[model samples]
Target: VGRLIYTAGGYFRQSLSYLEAYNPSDGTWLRLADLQVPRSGLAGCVVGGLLYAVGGRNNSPDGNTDSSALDCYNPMTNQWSPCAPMSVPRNRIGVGVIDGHIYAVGGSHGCIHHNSVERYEPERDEWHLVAPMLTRRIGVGVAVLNRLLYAVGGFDGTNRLNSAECYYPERNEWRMITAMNTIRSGAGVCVLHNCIYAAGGYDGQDQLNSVERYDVETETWTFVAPMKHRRSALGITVHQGRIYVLGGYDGHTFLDSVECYDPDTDTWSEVTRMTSGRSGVGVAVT
Candidate 1:
């Protein structure tokens, strides 16, 4: 359904400072403006026609450091502007945009991983605390399905989690749902065909190509088509009725390869590689 996909700043050797938009219509990528700060583990999503680059870890010498800082990029102007920062610093934070509001989910703070959740309001340009999850987690995968927020697998300090949860906005509650079949600490998650898909991630033991699908009506998870090679911390998005999987680590090294899949056929295939390898990249669709 999406005509264009966007990927930005990631880490390979050091924190890579770059941003690019991919057009599925032509199978090509357009390089865009670099982020004001070079960062990895950032959260990306679009709201009000503007793409946002949210909080993440930073490395700067001029005292330019704050994981809570927020920035939004306007496609029309091709520029990014600072926005309200979150109350807490969240590296590898997961973000979801729904009904004009953005929800920043679990991520690691310096010492520990958190189950912390925060809601951002554009009109007020402020972020406030929301109900935290039942399980403390970081490097989590979050997506919106049928206007409801769903958070899947993540690292919960001691273990890679197979657990999942959902947030009810009306009551400000995060309730646990059926856990996943695999422990995916850094799986790429997205909604496609009314179901939530959890793609490649590290299972604590190994980088994985295995994927899982969740059906709400049955509230069950089932194995689906896996990728060609193992990957963790990958970026995935839905485009033109298929899933496009981008850069991440493959246990041996950072990856620049791309993979595409069709749910109907349950088959995965390759595409043009990114210009450079990366992991912990931010991806979204416009």
Candidate 2:
């Protein structure tokens, strides 16, 4: 599920809280409940049996003033409910789920970037601070592998970043890790076959079509086949060994085109297009 940006009547505009579900087996989509509050730049993750939408801005030009609103969705009933708010209100947050708890990582609040991190406990409906990140970031890519949460590249206020780090829950600390080959922000990240794949995003100057893979054993990043489209704020997820890149912005237009990468072949191929253009969307697999 994700939000959509809409515009009309000159400067009058609003973000749509639209949510849709894709049926891969039939190549179809079905609309779900709209978000209670319209927002964008939020991050989401699945914990237990529900989908949680974390911090994001709501029709605000400056992301630093984003809301700390936390919302959850239950697909079984096609409904949404409020959850405990984060201690910090931020946008472009990186989210990951480890051991049934949701971790909200570094993002920006207005112009100030955050190195702060927090976790949510659904059972208690509470949010708690975790060890902060080594570097401040916004638009970072996050994924959990082997029970560790990895935070990838994003803008660090002064520059587009290439750095990456991992959070060790047991030790309650963060450690620097091998960085990506390309500096980018808004990239879609996911884990498959024990390797982290960081896909296309804005590389400071232009939207990128490049993709790279980080090998856990070698602690290095390797260039992989590029996507056909240059995307930012795209939704990505691993489904049955394939990486699906969903709708996003390409600097010029909102995109409805979809692509899939097969690690077995190290190649990307186009998939069926979405019914409408979308950006800053969230994706999850059942």
Best by TM-score: 1
lDDT of 1 at 169: 89
Residue 137 lDDT, candidate 1, scale 0-100: 77
Per-residue lDDT tens digits of candidate 1, residues 1-286?
3447889788877777798988876788889988988888887888887888877787677642438868888777889788998888888778898788899998988857888888899889989889999988788999998888998988888888999999998888989999999989889999998889999998889999998899888889999988997999888888878998898999899999889999889999987788898988888887
Query: How high a TM-score does candidate 2 get?
Result: 0.92
Runs off by more than 4 Å, candidate 1: 62-66
- At residue 44, candidate 2 shows an lDDT of 69
Q: Against the true structure, what is every candidate's RMSD?
A: 1.7, 4.2
TM-scores of all candidate predictions against the true structure:
0.96, 0.92
Report residue 82 deviation for candidate 2 (angstroms): 0.2
Least accurate 10 contiguous residues by lDDT in model 1 = 57-66
Clashes of 2: 2
lDDT of 2 by residue, 1-286 (tens): 3322111000013554777666666677777787877776777677876877787677644532576888888877978899889998878878999999988998888877988999999999999998999988898899999999999999888888999999999999999999899987999999999899999888889888899999898989999999999999787888778888887788988888889899999899987787667777666665
lDDT per prediction? Answer: 0.86, 0.81
